[PDB]
Write an enzyme that holds these catalytic residues in place. Sequence first.
Site, PDB file in Angstrom:
ATOM      1  N   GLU A   1      44.059  37.884  33.867  1.00 57.39           N
ATOM      2  CA  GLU A   1      42.722  37.477  33.466  1.00 57.39           C
ATOM      3  C   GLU A   1      42.446  38.007  32.066  1.00 57.39           C
ATOM      4  O   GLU A   1      42.557  39.198  31.820  1.00 57.39           O
ATOM      5  CB  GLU A   1      41.641  37.950  34.457  1.00 57.39           C
ATOM      6  CG  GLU A   1      40.208  37.724  33.917  1.00 57.39           C
ATOM      7  CD  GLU A   1      39.128  37.550  34.981  1.00 57.39           C
ATOM      8  OE1 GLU A   1      39.314  37.974  36.139  1.00 57.39           O
ATOM      9  OE2 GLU A   1      38.063  36.988  34.648  1.00 57.39           O
TER      10      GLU A   1
ATOM     11  N   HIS B   1      41.758  38.853  41.851  1.00 59.50           N
ATOM     12  CA  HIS B   1      42.477  37.866  41.071  1.00 59.50           C
ATOM     13  C   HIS B   1      43.769  38.587  40.721  1.00 59.50           C
ATOM     14  O   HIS B   1      44.021  38.906  39.550  1.00 59.50           O
ATOM     15  CB  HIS B   1      41.730  37.580  39.766  1.00 59.50           C
ATOM     16  CG  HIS B   1      40.356  37.006  39.942  1.00 59.50           C
ATOM     17  ND1 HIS B   1      40.130  35.737  40.441  1.00 59.50           N
ATOM     18  CD2 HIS B   1      39.137  37.503  39.615  1.00 59.50           C
ATOM     19  CE1 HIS B   1      38.833  35.489  40.434  1.00 59.50           C
ATOM     20  NE2 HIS B   1      38.208  36.547  39.943  1.00 59.50           N
TER      21      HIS B   1
ATOM     22  N   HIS C   1      39.464  37.130  30.239  1.00 54.96           N
ATOM     23  CA  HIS C   1      38.180  36.449  30.119  1.00 54.96           C
ATOM     24  C   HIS C   1      37.493  36.789  28.802  1.00 54.96           C
ATOM     25  O   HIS C   1      36.995  35.898  28.117  1.00 54.96           O
ATOM     26  CB  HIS C   1      37.281  36.776  31.319  1.00 54.96           C
ATOM     27  CG  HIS C   1      36.133  35.828  31.506  1.00 54.96           C
ATOM     28  ND1 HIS C   1      35.498  35.660  32.722  1.00 54.96           N
ATOM     29  CD2 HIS C   1      35.514  34.985  30.644  1.00 54.96           C
ATOM     30  CE1 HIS C   1      34.525  34.774  32.594  1.00 54.96           C
ATOM     31  NE2 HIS C   1      34.518  34.343  31.345  1.00 54.96           N
TER      32      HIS C   1
ATOM     33  N   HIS D   1      38.051  40.277  46.738  1.00 54.47           N
ATOM     34  CA  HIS D   1      38.573  41.432  46.004  1.00 54.47           C
ATOM     35  C   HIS D   1      38.916  42.531  46.999  1.00 54.47           C
ATOM     36  O   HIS D   1      38.280  42.640  48.044  1.00 54.47           O
ATOM     37  CB  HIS D   1      37.523  41.991  45.041  1.00 54.47           C
ATOM     38  CG  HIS D   1      37.520  41.344  43.695  1.00 54.47           C
ATOM     39  ND1 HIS D   1      38.351  41.754  42.674  1.00 54.47           N
ATOM     40  CD2 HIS D   1      36.770  40.335  43.189  1.00 54.47           C
ATOM     41  CE1 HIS D   1      38.126  41.013  41.603  1.00 54.47           C
ATOM     42  NE2 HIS D   1      37.167  40.148  41.887  1.00 54.47           N
TER      43      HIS D   1
ATOM     44  N   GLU E   1      36.098  28.895  43.072  1.00 56.02           N
ATOM     45  CA  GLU E   1      34.892  29.684  43.325  1.00 56.02           C
ATOM     46  C   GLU E   1      33.701  28.740  43.392  1.00 56.02           C
ATOM     47  O   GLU E   1      33.596  27.810  42.586  1.00 56.02           O
ATOM     48  CB  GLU E   1      34.677  30.747  42.232  1.00 56.02           C
ATOM     49  CG  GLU E   1      35.952  31.498  41.855  1.00 56.02           C
ATOM     50  CD  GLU E   1      35.785  32.490  40.736  1.00 56.02           C
ATOM     51  OE1 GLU E   1      34.638  32.786  40.336  1.00 56.02           O
ATOM     52  OE2 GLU E   1      36.827  32.985  40.261  1.00 56.02           O
TER      53      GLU E   1
ATOM     54  N   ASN F   1      28.184  40.273  44.858  1.00 54.81           N
ATOM     55  CA  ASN F   1      28.104  38.828  45.089  1.00 54.81           C
ATOM     56  C   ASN F   1      28.532  38.507  46.511  1.00 54.81           C
ATOM     57  O   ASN F   1      28.925  37.371  46.814  1.00 54.81           O
ATOM     58  CB  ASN F   1      29.029  38.067  44.133  1.00 54.81           C
ATOM     59  CG  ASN F   1      29.068  38.656  42.723  1.00 54.81           C
ATOM     60  OD1 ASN F   1      30.147  38.918  42.190  1.00 54.81           O
ATOM     61  ND2 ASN F   1      27.902  38.843  42.105  1.00 54.81           N
TER      62      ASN F   1
ATOM     63  N   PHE G   1      25.710  42.544  38.809  1.00 54.42           N
ATOM     64  CA  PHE G   1      26.627  41.399  38.888  1.00 54.42           C
ATOM     65  C   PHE G   1      27.928  41.672  39.655  1.00 54.42           C
ATOM     66  O   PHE G   1      28.680  40.738  39.946  1.00 54.42           O
ATOM     67  CB  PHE G   1      26.915  40.807  37.507  1.00 54.42           C
ATOM     68  CG  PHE G   1      25.992  39.692  37.127  1.00 54.42           C
ATOM     69  CD1 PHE G   1      26.281  38.380  37.496  1.00 54.42           C
ATOM     70  CD2 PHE G   1      24.826  39.948  36.399  1.00 54.42           C
ATOM     71  CE1 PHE G   1      25.422  37.332  37.143  1.00 54.42           C
ATOM     72  CE2 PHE G   1      23.956  38.911  36.043  1.00 54.42           C
ATOM     73  CZ  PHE G   1      24.253  37.598  36.417  1.00 54.42           C
TER      74      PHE G   1
ATOM     75  N   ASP H   1      36.497  40.563  36.751  1.00 55.08           N
ATOM     76  CA  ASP H   1      35.110  40.925  36.942  1.00 55.08           C
ATOM     77  C   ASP H   1      34.985  41.856  38.143  1.00 55.08           C
ATOM     78  O   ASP H   1      34.720  41.416  39.268  1.00 55.08           O
ATOM     79  CB  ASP H   1      34.281  39.671  37.154  1.00 55.08           C
ATOM     80  CG  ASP H   1      32.822  39.972  37.361  1.00 55.08           C
ATOM     81  OD1 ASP H   1      32.371  41.096  37.034  1.00 55.08           O
ATOM     82  OD2 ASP H   1      32.125  39.068  37.846  1.00 55.08           O
TER      83      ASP H   1
ATOM     84  N   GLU I   1      40.518  32.599  34.592  1.00 56.49           N
ATOM     85  CA  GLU I   1      39.712  32.754  33.378  1.00 56.49           C
ATOM     86  C   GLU I   1      40.508  33.301  32.204  1.00 56.49           C
ATOM     87  O   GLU I   1      40.243  34.397  31.696  1.00 56.49           O
ATOM     88  CB  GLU I   1      38.459  33.593  33.675  1.00 56.49           C
ATOM     89  CG  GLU I   1      37.594  32.970  34.768  1.00 56.49           C
ATOM     90  CD  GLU I   1      36.292  33.716  35.025  1.00 56.49           C
ATOM     91  OE1 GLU I   1      36.340  34.890  35.472  1.00 56.49           O
ATOM     92  OE2 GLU I   1      35.218  33.106  34.800  1.00 56.49           O
TER      93      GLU I   1
ATOM     94  N   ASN J   1      27.403  47.699  30.447  1.00 56.49           N
ATOM     95  CA  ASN J   1      27.666  47.246  31.810  1.00 56.49           C
ATOM     96  C   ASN J   1      26.927  45.962  32.164  1.00 56.49           C
ATOM     97  O   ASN J   1      25.971  45.565  31.482  1.00 56.49           O
ATOM     98  CB  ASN J   1      27.348  48.346  32.831  1.00 56.49           C
ATOM     99  CG  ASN J   1      25.886  48.726  32.837  1.00 56.49           C
ATOM    100  OD1 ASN J   1      25.054  48.062  33.471  1.00 56.49           O
ATOM    101  ND2 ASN J   1      25.560  49.803  32.131  1.00 56.49           N
TER     102      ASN J   1
HETATM  103  C1  LIG Z   1      29.253  33.211  32.434  1.00 53.91           C
HETATM  104  C2  LIG Z   1      29.575  34.413  33.321  1.00 53.91           C
HETATM  105  C3  LIG Z   1      28.414  34.702  34.269  1.00 53.91           C
HETATM  106  S1  LIG Z   1      31.119  34.150  34.163  1.00 53.91           S
HETATM  107  C4  LIG Z   1      31.143  34.347  35.922  1.00 53.91           C
HETATM  108  O1  LIG Z   1      30.772  35.669  36.301  1.00 53.91           O
HETATM  109  C5  LIG Z   1      30.572  35.752  37.707  1.00 53.91           C
HETATM  110  C6  LIG Z   1      29.752  37.001  38.016  1.00 53.91           C
HETATM  111  O2  LIG Z   1      29.821  37.307  39.413  1.00 53.91           O
HETATM  112  C7  LIG Z   1      31.948  35.693  38.368  1.00 53.91           C
HETATM  113  O3  LIG Z   1      32.723  36.822  37.977  1.00 53.91           O
HETATM  114  C8  LIG Z   1      32.681  34.414  37.943  1.00 53.91           C
HETATM  115  O4  LIG Z   1      34.061  34.496  38.321  1.00 53.91           O
HETATM  116  C9  LIG Z   1      32.553  34.088  36.448  1.00 53.91           C
HETATM  117  O5  LIG Z   1      32.833  32.700  36.256  1.00 53.91           O
HETATM  118 MG   LIG Z   2      35.998  36.796  34.752  1.00 54.08          MG
HETATM  119 NA    NA Z   3      30.737  39.584  39.740  1.00 54.60          NA
END
Ligand SMILES: CC(C)S[C@@H]1O[C@H](CO)[C@H](O)[C@H](O)[C@H]1O
Ligand SMILES: [Mg+2]
Ligand code: NA
EC number: 3.2.1.23
Lengths: 210, 1015
Positions: free
Chosen positions: B408, B383, B410, B349, B529, B596, B593, B193, B453, B589
């Site tokens: 990863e 990661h 995911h 990161h 996390e 963070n 997000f 991510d 993930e 996109n």
């Molecule tokens: C169900 C999703 C929101 S997964 C969620 O996304 C987050 C966004 O910052 C992080 O990347 C986390 O690692 C991930 O578990």
């Molecule tokens: Mg992820």
């Molecule tokens: Na994120």
Amino acid sequence: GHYQAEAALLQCTADTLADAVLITTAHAWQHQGKTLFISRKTYRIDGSGQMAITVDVEVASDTPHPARIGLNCQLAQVAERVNWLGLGPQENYPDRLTAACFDRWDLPLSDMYTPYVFPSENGLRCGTRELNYGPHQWRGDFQFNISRYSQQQLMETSHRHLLHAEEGTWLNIDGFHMGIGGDDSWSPSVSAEFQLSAGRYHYQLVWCQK
Amino acid sequence: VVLQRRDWENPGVTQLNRLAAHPPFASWRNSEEARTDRPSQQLRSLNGEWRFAWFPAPEAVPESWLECDLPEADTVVVPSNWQMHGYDAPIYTNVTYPITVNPPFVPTENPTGCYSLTFNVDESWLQEGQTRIIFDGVNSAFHLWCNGRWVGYGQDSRLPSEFDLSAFLRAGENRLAVMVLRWSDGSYLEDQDMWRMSGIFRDVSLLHKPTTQISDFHVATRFNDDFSRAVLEAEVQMCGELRDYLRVTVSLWQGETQVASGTAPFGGEIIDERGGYADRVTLRLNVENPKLWSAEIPNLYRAVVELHTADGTLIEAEACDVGFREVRIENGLLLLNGKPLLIRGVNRHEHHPLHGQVMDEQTMVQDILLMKQNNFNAVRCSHYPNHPLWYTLCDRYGLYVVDEANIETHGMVPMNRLTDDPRWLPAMSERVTRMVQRDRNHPSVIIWSLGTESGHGANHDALYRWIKSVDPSRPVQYEGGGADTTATDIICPMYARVDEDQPFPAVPKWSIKKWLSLPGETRPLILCEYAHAMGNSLGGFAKYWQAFRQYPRLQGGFVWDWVDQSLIKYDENGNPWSAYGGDFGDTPNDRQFCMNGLVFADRTPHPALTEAKHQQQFFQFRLSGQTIEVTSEYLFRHSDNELLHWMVALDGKPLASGEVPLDVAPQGKQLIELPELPQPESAGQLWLTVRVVQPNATAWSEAGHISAWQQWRLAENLSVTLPAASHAIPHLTTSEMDFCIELGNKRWQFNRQSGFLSQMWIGDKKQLLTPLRDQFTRAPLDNDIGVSEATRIDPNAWVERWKAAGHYQAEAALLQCTADTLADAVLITTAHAWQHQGKTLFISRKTYRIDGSGQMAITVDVEVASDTPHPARIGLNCQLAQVAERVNWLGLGPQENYPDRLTAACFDRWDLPLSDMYTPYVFPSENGLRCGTRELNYGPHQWRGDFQFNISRYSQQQLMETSHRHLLHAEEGTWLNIDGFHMGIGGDDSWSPSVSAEFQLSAGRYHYQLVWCQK
Ligand SMILES: CC(C)S[C@@H]1O[C@H](CO)[C@H](O)[C@H](O)[C@H]1O
Ligand SMILES: [Mg+2]
Ligand code: NA
Ligand SMILES: [Mg+2]
Ligand code: NA
Ligand code: NA
């Protein structure tokens, strides 16, 4: 000095409004110089005969959290039934009210007292929106108990059999009441969320004859 | 043949002609330079100006490029990501893969970076020994050519690929050609991510090694039960010709002192029926009373590994820093040096707002210092394995590291579709094995991670066992597939809440307290996390630390995450702004997000940072009477660089202060007896504030750095005095549309059609631009929004509950608006009902009492319908005409704080420029609130009571209509929001409602009061 606190009047005024009379008061409960509580009140008596009471209380952050924040009085009337819209039918307290149900309840007065062998505050019912006794109706959001016994006689008396009905009916209407605890009976056990610790408290009542 | 094979679409091919992985080599030819870790003449950087061309596919690359530089190509700096030079766009996507999920295939349109370098090689390098090139980071795959001839291929963006160039080079000029592919089969294992970028983004170098060489070495440190004796055990492997006269000396240095030494010929013990490793030797050095390594005191020794002749002629030397420390899980606790850890950790990161995902020393050092200054002791390499300097710095400054393999997956459905497939085991093994082989000598690395993930597959189990097999010194953790599978030594969930079970099918996230005691369970719990720090967040953070402290087996966690992944874009004028997902044209996109962070991309703190520092404190405090009890949460060090500053103030006015040195042992206690406090004869609340100050500078902090603080209410003296009654009495001026009140230069106006204070006048001038009205809403926070979007509504998010119930577009309806002249005042009563589609949401009952001293006492009583969603706030707002320089308040501060994020704020008298009362979140929302405020001052205005407030040049409406911070324009006057009550911000995660029950406005009936006056 909670059990000895002497009320000292700060303010007491009257006003004439278009359709009502407003009585503003302020008290300070003190003990040997220290101010424990300040009670700020308005009474609003209007055309329909309702007395709206607002109460705003200050609690000194450094006094032990009080057992209750309410009003009391000895009523002259003695009725037979107690009728209320709130939690019941049995005695319930803030940390012991999950069993109680919200409905309209009607019991004999004697059922609003609990005969604990060693007498204490008892018979509270919580989350009450309306209380009916004889000619009196009280509306709001409060906790109450009602009986022929005063907080003073209850705490002065070691056994229930030694109690005597007092003239009239003692009424305790609390905006707020501390938890009762019981995780044990040899150390304070009332949980933080049931202690009266907010410092500033507000409740309102409407008192009319129905 | 290279275009023919398509190795970048074959998970069976992950490298061609690539050398074995190994720990950091420098091939020193002088043992002293090795000891001191000075630069080595045998390790050259190839960083700097390279030639670069972009192509839409590898088929579009001309064959001449192998022989000649391309004239149309440019000159760019290396290391770099090519998206950062504008060649194409970076893509921000969270879960969903940036390419179509068709394993093992990638799009035919595969952006291809052709890099080249003409460089010199000295004669000396080519007459003797071995010349290799090292690419520390290439995203995501690449073929390498040297002087026109093909050398090899490599994948894994995050680990070094090394190739032997000895047979390819010539004396004088040489040319490398590197064909870097954006997408390969490796991308399926790199679904982190984060921004999806590419290119030669880490250091490139040339290393010269002798023909007879140290090819690998492992350092272990084992202890007796009380840590008074260690054995350093060093295993060394050579390549080259095996000869009798060969020796290794491993020697251990503390500064300039050699504490131990051992020397042996090659040939380890017999291993099996065919003998032993004739090319290996194990050295064992006894160390008495070793200085132990921890994040608290990062004691390091230097191990020099010398390859030499019996007679003593050096061949080469390698070296590393050794931290003497044991990591073991015993009886369900993670222990360091026999003591249970409390992980104050963060996910980090590798991210830079200008250089993309390139890392440099300055930034890494900057990050470490901020981390430590804010009471972190741990970092998770989310990661992927990091830039190699990172571990070195972590060793030296002292942080516990979780080293995580670059796996990863995911976006797979289900998440374990690859990791359960034996066919993806080879590609996975290399990403785990090559990490261990590289990083296993860094003491800072205390835990290995199998990635993130990727669900839970049989491949995880194999690789778990592999790591446990080759390295018994470190626990292996892995969160995927339920966070407590057979592939993890540590229960390591992500965003599992403190008391609240979230019982998802198959992958439940239990209450972390409940999780520890599930039938049969014995493992420690550390969250990989937690506390998603997205926008205005970190609500409920204190709840975690309270639990971590009470439960021995809850051993902390890693915050998500360190730094916002915003990227700098420029506008027409040329001024920078911060950009997120979808701002480079990139689609699909996941928008904001990627942000963070506890800190902004430029490393400026968010308000949440201070909340983390406070909750992550190392000194705990209790007050009884006049005794402060100080307890240390350090495991190893005494408080030998600490004093306590105490301070007592009456509603912000200082009365006494002092200093006591702190002398508390690890896990110990110190009682401090305050002197007689002088009872003030004046109304107010006495507050005690203590701050732990470090008087001396450190490697990580300045002199006067504050590491811990706490407050207590002492004695309170409630005001019993009535104000001196006034001569004057205000005049009521009734009209068709208006109630006007006059007193001296002051004038109030209540519009009888709206029912609100429409205007106030001091002398002549207007004070309001917008009338004073109730507000029940806020500019939605990231946590209020979750994953809800315009074209895909999540009806569960708080914002959507609010919208659907009509909260944002409810209209005030006047039920009542009377005026009454009293003895010494004028009383205005009002009543409003906020309605939407026939439903009464709120009812506001107010009285304004304007007395003869010019003060307006406002009393608000709100009813909230039990069946409407609980509102974001219950307060008032208006837009004042005044723009003043300063804001002055008696309350919690100085920084932004909310009901579920206010523990770090201190009650005092604060004074800040208006601009500090605005928090510049990249995605704008409600911000800048301060809670528990008894007095607010702005120009000639003063409000008193017990309220929360924000104050800024931006309306809640503009904050909620604007997507980026830079697109905000300062409005005329100052928007003032005064709340009696405000809902928590949450953040246990950022995709479901996360605001805890006790911070929701659910009481149904709410009361607040404010006095307003000029001063
Ligand atoms: C169900 C999703 C929101 S997964 C969620 O996304 C987050 C966004 O910052 C992080 O990347 C986390 O690692 C991930 O578990
Ligand atoms: Mg992820
Ligand atoms: Na994120
Ligand atoms: Mg491949
Ligand atoms: Na713990
Ligand atoms: Na917004």
